[PDB]
From a paper:
The evolutionary distinct and smaller family of DOCK proteins activates CDC42 and RAC to control cell migration, morphogenesis and phagocytosis, and have been implicated as important components of tumour cell movement and invasion. To understand the molecular architecture and mechanism of DOCK−ELMO GEFs, we have used cryo-electron microscopy to determine structures of DOCK2−ELMO1 alone and as a ternary complex with nucleotide-free RAC1, and combined this with a crystal structure of ELMO2RBD in complex with RHOG. The binary DOCK2−ELMO1 complex adopts a closed, auto-inhibited conformation, whereas in the DOCK2−ELMO1−RAC1 ternary complex, DOCK2−ELMO1 adopts an open, active conformation through a conformational change of the ELMO1 subunit.
Purified DOCK2−ELMO1 forms a stable complex with nucleotide-free RAC1, which was further stabilized by crosslinking to avoid disassociation during cryo-EM grid preparation. We then analysed the structure of the DOCK2−ELMO1−RAC1 complex by single particle cryo-EM. Refinement of the combined particles resulted in an EM density map with an overall resolution of 4.1 Å. The ternary DOCK2−ELMO1−RAC1 dimeric complex adopts an elongated “S”-like shape with pseudo twofold symmetry, measuring 320 Å and 65 Å in the longest and shortest dimensions, respectively. Located at the centre of DOCK2−ELMO1−RAC1 is DOCK2DHR2, dimerized through its A lobe, and associated with nucleotide-free RAC1 through its B and C lobes. 3D classification showed that in the DOCK2−ELMO1−RAC1 ternary complex, ELMO1NTD is predominantly in the open-conformation. In the ternary DOCK2−ELMO1−RAC1 complex (open-conformation), ELMO1 adopts an elongated, gently curved shape. In addition, our structure suggests that ELMO1PH is directly involved in DOCK2 GEF activity by interacting simultaneously with DOCK2DHR2 and nucleotide-free RAC1, thereby stabilizing DOCK2DHR2–RAC1 interactions. Superimposing the crystal structure of the ELMO2RBD−RHOG complex onto ELMO1RBD of the DOCK2−ELMO1 complexes showed that for DOCK2−ELMO1−RAC1, with ELMO1NTD in the open-conformation, the RHOG-binding site on ELMO1RBD is readily accessible for RHOG engagement.
Residue numbers in the entry:
A (entry chain C): 1 to 177
B (entry chain B): 5 to 139, 153 to 333, 354 to 624, 634 to 726
Write the structure that this text describes.
Amino acid sequence: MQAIKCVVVGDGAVGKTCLLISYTTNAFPGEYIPTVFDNYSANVMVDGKPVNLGLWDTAGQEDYDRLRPLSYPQTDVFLICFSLVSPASFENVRAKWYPEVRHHCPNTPIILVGTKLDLRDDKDTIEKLKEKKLTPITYPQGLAMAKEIGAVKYLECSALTQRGLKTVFDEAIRAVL
Amino acid sequence: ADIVKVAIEWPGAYPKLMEIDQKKPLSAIIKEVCDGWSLANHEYFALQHADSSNFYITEKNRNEIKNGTILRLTTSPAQNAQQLHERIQSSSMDAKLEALKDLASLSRDVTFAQEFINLDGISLLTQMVESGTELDMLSFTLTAFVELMDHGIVSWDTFSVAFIKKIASFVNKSAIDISILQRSLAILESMVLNSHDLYQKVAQEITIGQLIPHLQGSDQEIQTYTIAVINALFLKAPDERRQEMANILAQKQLRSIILTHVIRAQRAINNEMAHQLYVLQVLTFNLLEDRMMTKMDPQDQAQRDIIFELRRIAFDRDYKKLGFINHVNPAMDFTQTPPGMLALDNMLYFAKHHQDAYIRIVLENSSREDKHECPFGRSSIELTKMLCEILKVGELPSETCNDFHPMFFTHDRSFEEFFCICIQLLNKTWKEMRATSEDFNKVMQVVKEQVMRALTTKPSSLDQFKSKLQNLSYTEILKIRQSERMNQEDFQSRPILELKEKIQPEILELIKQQRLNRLVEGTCFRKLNARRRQDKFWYCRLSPNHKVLHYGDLEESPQGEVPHDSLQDKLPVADIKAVVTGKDCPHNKEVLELAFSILYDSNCQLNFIAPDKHEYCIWTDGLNALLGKDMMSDLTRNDLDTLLSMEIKLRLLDLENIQIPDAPPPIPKEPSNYDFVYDC
């Protein structure tokens, strides 16, 4: 059940809160009760890594560039979040949490994810990804990006679907591997 | 309502454009035209064609008038007949020549020829031929004559004996002007056809040695009309004198003459000469019908002596070793007609002219006391009967047939020669059959199926006929014909093709259950860039539920399969968007034909390289199944056809030897009474 120091970095437009809150309440594709104080957590008897994760959520907001820096020095891995309906995510990636990785540790598993994967490509997300005239980023832009600064996997997950979820949680666990 | 647009012309005037109403009489039309042309006496005029041979128009022929035709008003048919009767007898030779030409031109019309025969112009032409001196004029004369008489308004018996002797002199003298001979032969043929007394008068005025040399001419029309006169004298001849006429013709080598100068001549045989050889053939075969229907008198000692001599030539029971059903009185076996006396004529010919074959076939079955002997007598009886049947001995000639057997023209007795040939082939087939006396009739059918399949090849002579018989087998060529008459009628017959489509989809689904099994099993594949111990081969499998996949990996192996599970195992199946092929895989040209990618949730896909075109059919078709699509490969269609072959096979096991109605029979009216007397 071995728990882990899981500090989930990730930018404010991402929303991993609902994400965790819809997986692990273990209810449906969709409806889960979201939460406020959000060090989250989850698990499985996962892989003989029969383990629990303690998701260390600081504020996802920027007033923590110490308090979040007070969440780094020894976190096993880091959940490092971006999204797809807004390329600023596909950029902050080598740009913000990645330095912040460079910044606290050059040793641990460090990875990436574009949220809004399920949202990248609506005619309306297509639509106001063209109105802003940037890209419903190609995951290919990913496979470069993640060849680039250090996403040891690279993933996506959505709690509306409650999906990509374990997928995400996959090596978010087996980083041990 | 019934209108035809026509232009009417006149020498020296402009054409009048008339919308002729077909209900108005012709006289009113001609009157309108003459009034438009200021011509008095409209009743002196009629209407004719300005085009080709310009038949005069009557209330009957005016219906054949098409729109836009050019027509010429002219003298009435009566006026034309009058001016022609005047001018064809003119003392001016040029006027008489032009008159005879125009008359031979216009005599093909029945409406003018009516007026011309009604004035005894037939007698004018008759006198012109009978007493004309230094006789072009005669050619048009006789052409007009035949065109006039071809319309049946007066009888041919009106011709005087002087004209008959004159045309018989023209056909009977040394070769004269070609056209005169053609017209004289035509007149002779027609007068023989229409009158018996005229045939009597003609037969005494012409000889065989006169009708024969006209076949020596290089003009094929001379030949056609000559053999036409021949067949006319033959059809009109008495039955008793017909055989004598045939003997007189054969004595002058008529058969070999036609062989050397017609069927082997330089000029190809036309339709009419084929008809004439056909009628000569059917009559020469008819010459045997009299002996076909005459029964033997078993009390006639000479007729029994013929049987005794035919036995003596062979043997040197009392008749059981010769093959007659009646062992003590074989004459009874001849009282049935057909064939009766023809059988005896044929077998006596086979003994006198083909003694070797006769003694062979009789001594090969005269000492056989097993049930395998071939009775020669009964076989010859039934064989003359069946050859009279297949040839249709005793049939009258008709106008619709042009066929002949050229073989008969190579031998004077080719009938009895062919008899000997077919009895030889009969005993040959009998020995090949291992047949018995009980299987007699069957054997005959085979021999029939033999002979009827040889004459269709049109053998030029009797030896080619024998070679064809040597080629025929039992019932091997008939078995090939039976197997071929089904492959064509399977698809080219709507009554057979109709069930080819009702079950056809269910036949494909019958295949598709096998394809679903082939989907559940799962086969090997090929990974791209799978070098350096990466698993090139990799097998597959799928759950029974058709909603989750299960596949693994393999290696290059000398022995075979190693079903080791991979992490790439469960891909639920209801998610498969579509399966693409060829270039649409996102990543040696032959593997690209074997390359095909499963396409599902937008960017999650998998590429494949099937182990063969077999599995390339299997996988893509089972994936069309997992999404319900029709099968795309032509090997699946080959399985479809291999199935529907047996599936219509089971059905033809119900409709054998029954004519397949390609035009569907109609549904009759319903039974108004629904009171079933027998219950359900």
